[PDB]
Design brief:
2 copies of one chain form a homodimer. Chain A has 4 domains: 142 residues, Peroxidase, domain 1 (Orthogonal Bundle), CATH 1.10.520; 133 residues, Orthogonal Bundle (Peroxidase, domain 2); 168 residues, Peroxidase, domain 1; 128 residues, Peroxidase, domain 2. In chain A, 35% of the residues lie in helices and 5% in strands. A 3-stranded antiparallel beta sheet of chain A has the order 3-4-5. A 3-stranded antiparallel beta sheet of chain A has the order 8-9-10. Chain A has a two-stranded antiparallel ribbon with strand order 1-2. Chains A and B meet through helix 5, helix 18, helix 19, strand 8 and helix 22 of A and helix 5, helix 18, helix 19, strand 8 and helix 22 of B. The structure holds protoporphyrin IX containing FE (2 copies) and alpha-D-glucopyranose (2 copies). The PDB classes it as oxidoreductase. The entry lists the keywords oxidoreductase. It forms a dimeric assembly. The entry is titled "Crystal Structure of the Catalase-Peroxidase (KatG) R418L mutant from Mycobacterium Tuberculosis".
């Protein structure tokens, strides 16, 4: 290699390529954010004139620009594409991707080959952003532009939520191992796609427009479509709807040779003002645009919603052919339909053309059955597409509470994981006290109590904001029978006891107050923690925010929740099979998902260990002599040089810690030892392990607990 | 390559290795710091019982530990070494390194080859840290241990300052281009060392103990010593003193084969608890320790200060020889002095032994002259050593105001860049107003006025805290004749006018109030900025903290200040010759040195441009129609897509920006264009470029100006 300046990207990952990267816990730091801590986007966007906004976007769409002139004089379709690529990175495995951070404007995504030209697309909207300033995020604007495009070309959309917060440095996501753009080192078996990924190649949104690995076989392309879309939460109906609806607008761009297209934005030179893919071919823009290399124009009404796409697809026979840049497309057999497809810049007509993936929709059995139906019933398409699209651009916004502004529809949807609205008066300070008492009297140990509250709350992920302790989904499928949550243990026992306390309280009922199961689960941990803190000479009181409600099993899509099952929870010292990296990297990814900082992550492991939140209540990492008592013993003992650590002879990624007389005194996993071993983590352990550290540990621990308990609580935030 | 998970170090620098790393401007982020914003180290350390602490460290030094047992039963010398390696990374070129952040405890430094065994040393102190908690930083403790070591073996040290604040993630410093440990790709010419580096090889503190490139030639080794020490601010006397004083204590370690030493801390396995270099040789510790591979014991009194080192060096003749691990050392000719040097663990005696670098001190003309003197005059050594050591561990603490606790000596020293204490009453709210008025009336333009303030204040560097607008050093050598500051321009003119206003006010004098020249320079910019703000419809008032005093040329080591001359200041659109990377990376480095965040960097470039802070008052980047008026025009115009950018035909790393009619309307440097071209910077530009942005720009700009005006003001902080 060759070490570089830090200003030029060099650092410690250059010496030890595989070390833990603690930087994933301080993504998008306050200092980096020019808005200042005062700033509350929700507050700003809810003052926004939506009509004025729509009018301003419409004006942009219909005002062509020298530096990237507009197909058919209307940018709408490009804006639709844009919005789709914005939302289309989302994947269900980890909730990462999606249009929620406006990440498309930063690396790597701003320079993905599949996002060619979208740089131009984004730039075009600056005039709108200029006008709205802080009241409108890029995150919100990019997908809204796509939604206004649909409107302005006569398709009525189902609604729209504002509220995506802009970020100031790019979100670090794992996009695959491939070191080259468009590479494919991500399949095995018949055609099994590497988790978590939901594209077929590096730098693609979903599938190859020319079919798997460039091979234009529609039956084969469908398998990839089906699979990648499933992993972006779209089933068969939604998928079909999405592509047909999509390609009812605009056209592709492959006017001349692929190799006359310069380098992508991050590699572009300075005078290009952050715009890449400059074309030496022709004018290089407009008439001559090379984006994807393909040259299809799907409908004869590229800037209007109607049924041509499905009509064209079924109303001809198709034969293989090559774009002016040598790309596989389809075109109509025996020169049928010649001249009926209009030119983007008033040239002559053109023949009916289609992507290999478009034919999938007629050639695959399931896609056909669906799309033939909509050929004779377009108002069914217009309905399904309205729905899919809405879901597509809202998938990663989590709880419906977050959706903002005039256009949010009245109706809730299953994939929003909804929860009943608060229907009664909420418990006050007195009933809270009262209940806490009752919960300790219930004979549920601190261990069960905390184990449970954690199990509930920690199901959350910051990525798409799904999961959490709201909804009380811990008692429904599939959460109630997750390995890590342990059904074999006593979770059912704990649930039952808690429901009983709920009912009791709910008869007693002072006035019109009721308590939900969801609140009670969380309250339980809070009570337990209060107890465990006393049992080690502290009178701390753990804060609690009531308001959670209880979902029915009907409001809970079992299949959808599959993806939140922890395969690894270092906080509960759980590690089941098939994680990509060893235990400790899993811990970090998990902390990153819970929106925790390294300090927060540290104290939680500390506290959780000694409260015996541990899975199967194993002794690993429980470096205390005391039972169910909240102390920093974890930290003090971790730092004890009188203990000597070796891997267990019974080889199984666990370890023994012996003292001066050779007795095994402590055992522990990798997740436990990495805190005393990694120099950054050990630095933190030394803070909480000092002699003066006790009250501060208890404080910081509670502050963190309470943070995790509140992660999904957008309803009050 | 092979892309990794972010949790495992992968990111965007993998796709474009050489892109700008804006992460250097958010080093050590608040969220990562387990202390919380309330925490005030100054206030904690100042409550520490220093005697108790000395006692507690003494007790550690003399209590040997199984896992790394103590040479001669006293750890002192190891602590000395440690403290030396802690301070020893510092280099004058950029002020980076030094013991001030306690960086030795993190990567890369914790695993430098030269830092072998120091992991053990640090760990040995945990018992102390444990006892003092937040009242004592690892930064302060590591060097203090060294100083207490010196005291406890009977050498009286000159004083000690507390106040180094611990940091939570490692400072990203450029250590050289070498991809292998101990490599050397850093020389050229006769023996010219690559700036900024001050070591001969990668992972060395100063020089090779076996002489240049392992070649044990003393006259040659001395050239390296002279050179590297110079670049760590030591001259000839100081250097000699340091090594002799140093080696009056302890021994080296090379008991058996070099290749039986395991991997260094960062690459060590988990059960080692962050300790590297485990030895399979013998017990691997103590009697058998392998650290550097060499096996020298310099004096016969390894744990006592006296004159043996110099006596032994001069009182024998030396012949080449090899350590048990095949390292070049010297030993006494014709078996003289056999058995007289004692064993670390009560073995038999040993012969007089020396490093090749030790002989340098006798063999080099200049070192010989100096050391022969101290052979007959040990009290002069004891005096010089006391002084160099103090300077060594205090070099990077900047202003003497920061030094803390009972042990700071009374006397000031030239290398501390001192400034007169405040000898009068300071100007209050009215005199400030009054003078601001007088400065505008002076007919100094906003441009000169700001250019100057900036030139003064921006000489600061956060690295070793040297530089700044305190001391009014702008008018003395060498600052007054710095290319970038422009002597050919009217700096003299501005100085003179200012001195005049100083004098006038000083006669007028309401009671016992005086104003310094330093305060006046700063005040000047603040008035100018207040003026330029009005001239664009804003009544903002710029805050100002009086208290700066004026240094004499006697208090100002000209040669020392040489290193602070900007070879590049993107804020003044200045770029002179011989910087390692292009204009824009220099900008970032400079911002990092000024402790600025990207938002801060951004608004400053914006404001400075339009106030015509530009060097040689060049038009580059001045994207405004208005003169000396504070607006966001820079930002608005940078985001104007109506302008087209190309490199000047007159090829010189500048650019032309033309409009719709082909006329050059704007010109600019790389430093200017990168703000519209790098996606993260462009994101910030877009905040300050919006239509609603005007007041917020002015606010944030002032806030940043005021921050830079105050960088060196530890006297009031
Ligand atoms: C099977 C999955 C899909 C594939 C393989 C695919 C592929 C493509 C390609 C290659 C282009 C040409 C880009 C260019 O050269 O300008 C394109 C354009 C376009 N795509 Fe799709 N796409 C897919 C799904 C979608 C979806 C789900 C939508 C929206 C719901 C959509 C909307 C559009 C639009 C509106 C354009 C035209 C943009 C313009 O006029 O510049 N596509 N698509
Ligand atoms: C000319 C530059 C220097 C070189 C090349 C050098 C080299 C070395 C080496 C190779 C060791 C043996 C490492 C080991 O096996 O423990 C050592 C030890 C030591 N050095 Fe130096 N040194 C230099 C300057 C200094 C300075 C300036 C000081 C302090 C002011 C110092 C203080 C010590 C002490 C106290 C030890 C003994 C450590 C122990 O007993 O465990 N050295 N040095
Ligand atoms: O009466 C309504 C209350 O009791 C119900 O049975 C629900 O479980 C609870 O969430 C609600 O607050
Ligand atoms: O009066 C003599 C000196 O005192 C003043 O207060 C100023 O601080 C200084 O620059 C001046 O030369």
């Amino acid at each position: 290699g060759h070490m570089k300046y830090p200003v030029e990207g060099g650092g410690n990952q250059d010496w030890w390529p595989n070390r833990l990267n603690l930087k994933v816990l301080h993504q998008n730091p306050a200092v980096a954010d020019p808005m200042g801590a005062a700033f509350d986007y929700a507050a700003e966007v809810a003052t926004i004139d939506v009509d004025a906004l729509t009018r301003d976007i419409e004006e942009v769409m219909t005002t062509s620009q020298p530096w990237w002139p507009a197909d058919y004089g209307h940018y709408g379709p490009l804006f639709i594409r844009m919005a789709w690529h914005a939302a289309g990175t989302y994947r269900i495995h980890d909730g990462r991707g999606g249009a929620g951070g406006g990440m498309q404007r930063f690396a790597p995504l701003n320079s993905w080959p599949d996002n060619a030209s979208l740089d131009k697309a984004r730039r075009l909207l600056w005039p709108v952003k200029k006008k709205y300033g802080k009241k409108l995020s890029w995150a919100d604007l990019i997908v809204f532009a796509g939604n206004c495009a649909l409107e302005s070309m006569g398709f009525k959309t189902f609604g729209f939520g504002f509220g995506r917060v802009d970020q100031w440095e790019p979100d670090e996501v794992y996009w695959g191992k491939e070191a080259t753009w468009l590479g494919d080192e991500r399949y095995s078996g018949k055609r099994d796609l590497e988790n978590p990924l939901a594209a077929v190649q590096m730098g693609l949104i979903y599938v190859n427009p020319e079919g798997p690995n460039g091979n234009p076989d529609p039956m084969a392309a469908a398998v990839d479509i089906r699979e990648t879309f499933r992993r972006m939460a779209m089933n068969d109906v939604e998928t079909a709807a999405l592509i047909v609806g999509g390609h009812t607008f605009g056209k592709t761009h492959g006017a001349g040779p692929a190799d006359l297209v310069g380098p992508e934005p991050e590699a572009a030179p300075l005078e290009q003002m952050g715009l890449g893919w400059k074309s030496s071919y022709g004018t290089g823009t407009g008439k001559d645009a090379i984006t994807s290399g393909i040259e299809v124009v799907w409908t004869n009404t590229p800037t209007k919603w109607d049924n041509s796409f499905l009509e064209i697809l079924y109303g001809y026979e198709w034969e293989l052919t090559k774009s002016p840049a040598g790309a596989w497309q389809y075109t109509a057999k025996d020169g049928a339909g010649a001249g009926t497809i209009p030119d983007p810049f008033g040239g002559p007509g053109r023949s009916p053309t289609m992507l290999a993936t478009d034919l999938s929709l007629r050639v695959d059995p399931i896609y056909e059955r669906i799309t033939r139906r909509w050929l004779e019933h377009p108002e069914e398409l217009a309905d399904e597409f309205a729905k899919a699209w809405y879901k597509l651009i809202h998938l990663d916004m989590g709880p419906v509470a977050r959706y903002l502004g005039p256009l949010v529809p009245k109706q809730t949807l299953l994939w929003q994981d909804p929860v009943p609205a608060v229907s009664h008066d909420l418990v006050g300070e007195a009933e809270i006290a009262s209940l806490k008492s009752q919960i300790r009297a219930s004979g549920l140990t601190v261990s069960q109590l905390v184990s449970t509250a954690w199990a509930a709350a920690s199901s959350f992920r910051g990525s798409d904001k799904r999961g959490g302790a709201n909804g009380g989904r811990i008692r429904l499928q599939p959460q109630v029978g997750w390995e890590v949550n342990d059904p074999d243990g006593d979770l059912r026992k704990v649930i039952r006891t808690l429901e009983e306390i709920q009912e009791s309280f709910n008869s007693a009922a002072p006035g019109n107050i009721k308590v939900s199961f969801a609140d009670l689960v969380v309250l339980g941990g809070c009570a337990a923690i209060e107890k465990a803190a006393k049992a080690a000479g502290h009178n701390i009181t753990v804060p609690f925010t009531p308001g959670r409600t209880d979902a029915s099993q009907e409001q809970t899509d079992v299949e959808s929740f599959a993806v939140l099952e922890p395969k690894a929870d270092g906080f509960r010292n759980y590690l089941g099979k098939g994680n990509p990296l060893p235990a400790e990297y899993m811990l970090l990814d998990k902390a990153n998902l819970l929106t925790l900082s390294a300090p927060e992550m540290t104290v939680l492991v500390g506290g959780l260990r000694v409260l015996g939140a541990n899975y199967k209540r194993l002794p690993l990492g429980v470096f205390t002599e005391a039972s169910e008592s909240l102390t920093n013993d974890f930290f003090v003992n971790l730092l004890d040089m009188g203990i000597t650590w070796e891997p267990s002879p019974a080889d199984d990624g666990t370890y023994q810690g012996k003292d001066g007389s050779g007795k095994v005194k402590w055992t522990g996993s990798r997740v436990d030892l990495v805190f005393g071993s990694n120099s950054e983590l050990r630095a933190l352990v030394e803070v909480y392990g000092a002699d003066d550290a006790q009250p501060k540990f208890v404080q910081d621990f509670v502050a963190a607990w309470d943070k995790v308990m509140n992660l999904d609580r957008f309803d009050v935030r």
